[PDB]
Amino acid sequence: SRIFYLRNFNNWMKSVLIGEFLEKVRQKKKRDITVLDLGCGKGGDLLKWKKGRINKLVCTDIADVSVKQCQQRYEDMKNRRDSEYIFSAEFITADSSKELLIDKFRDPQMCFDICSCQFVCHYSFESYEQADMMLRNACERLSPGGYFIGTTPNSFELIRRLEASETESFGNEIYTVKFQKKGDYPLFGCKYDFNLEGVVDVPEFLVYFPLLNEMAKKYNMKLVYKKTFLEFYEEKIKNNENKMLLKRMGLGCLSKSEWEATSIYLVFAFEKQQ
Ligand SMILES: Nc1ncnc2c1ncn2[C@@H]1O[C@H](CSCC[C@H](N)C(=O)O)[C@@H](O)[C@H]1O
Ligand SMILES: O=C(Cc1ccsc1)N1CCC[C@H](c2[nH]nc3ncccc23)C1
């Protein structure tokens, strides 16, 4: 199928997002960029961190199999290079919705300039304590001026499509979202099935972004911006560095169906206050 159209477009989205806030970090900390990749998966963003020229990376995921794949991909990157430097990394298996990551870090008092949480944080909204815990994990160890960036389904788009659907499901040939019931969107535990054909079929939880925003305040976070994937793309392609990067990473235009899948998402970035 066309899995890698969406995969690579989404990776271009993450690269533009990561690149933007790495540049904002580097405008101050050219010294020792430290990044928490929360829900790193199998390490899809390792290369972006390598190109970002960061110094330390904590890769953590709930799936141990994915963390070890992340570790292996990292060691493969490290084991050969045109380059001479590459960030150091630690790899932590953990439910960042239930466990304190500082309990696992090599260095507990370490601080991050960026916590990147790409397509992960909505799993934290099973419950308030889990949503709070993931925020704490993403944000508590952020240095003042550090960034909490991520991508997560846009609850408005999900709900809008749900209310517009004649059923509790919606989607196309590429993806299906099924809510358990309609009109019942609890702050937490609002579960729905997300099926991305050939990619993932996993239950997710509605993240009402104003709720995520309010909750980030508890960790001295302020929203830098929230952008739908449409807003973000339409804005970011205007910069032709981003455009060319999309031509190099992408496999061609997204299909209407792919864009329908991708458009459920939003990009967000918060900054740790002084
Ligand atoms: N509670 C939790 N804590 C840590 N990671 C979680 C999690 N719930 C889900 N995940 C992870 O979130 C990831 C979602 S897929 C996104 C992976 C990666 N960030 C990327 O952009 O490619 C998966 O790897 C999954 O294992
Ligand atoms: O583009 C991405 C990142 C990506 C794409 C292909 S592999 C990583 N997205 C959007 C759709 C779902 C992805 C997702 N969520 N949960 C997952 N679990 C397992 C595997 C994938 C998972 C996140």
UniProtKB/Swiss-Prot annotation:
Its EC number is 2.1.1.56. Widely expressed. It catalyses: a 5'-end (5'-triphosphoguanosine)-ribonucleoside in mRNA + S-adenosyl-L-methionine = a 5'-end (N(7)-methyl 5'-triphosphoguanosine)-ribonucleoside in mRNA + S-adenosyl-L-homocysteine. Coiled coil: none annotated. Its main location: nucleus. Changing residue 123 to A: Loss of activity. Keywords: Methyltransferase, mRNA capping, mRNA processing, Nucleus, Phosphoprotein, RNA-binding, S-adenosyl-L-methionine, Transferase. MRNA binds at residues 10-11. Changing residue 247 to E: Decreased S-adenosyl-L-methionine binding and methyltransferase activity in absence of RAMAC. Decreased interaction with RAMAC. S-adenosyl-L-methionine binds at residues 14, 39, 61, 95, 118, 123. Methyltransferase activity is activated by RAMAC. Belongs to the class I-like SAM-binding methyltransferase superfamily. mRNA cap 0 methyltransferase family. This is mRNA cap guanine-N(7) methyltransferase. It comes from Homo sapiens (Human). The gene is RNMT.
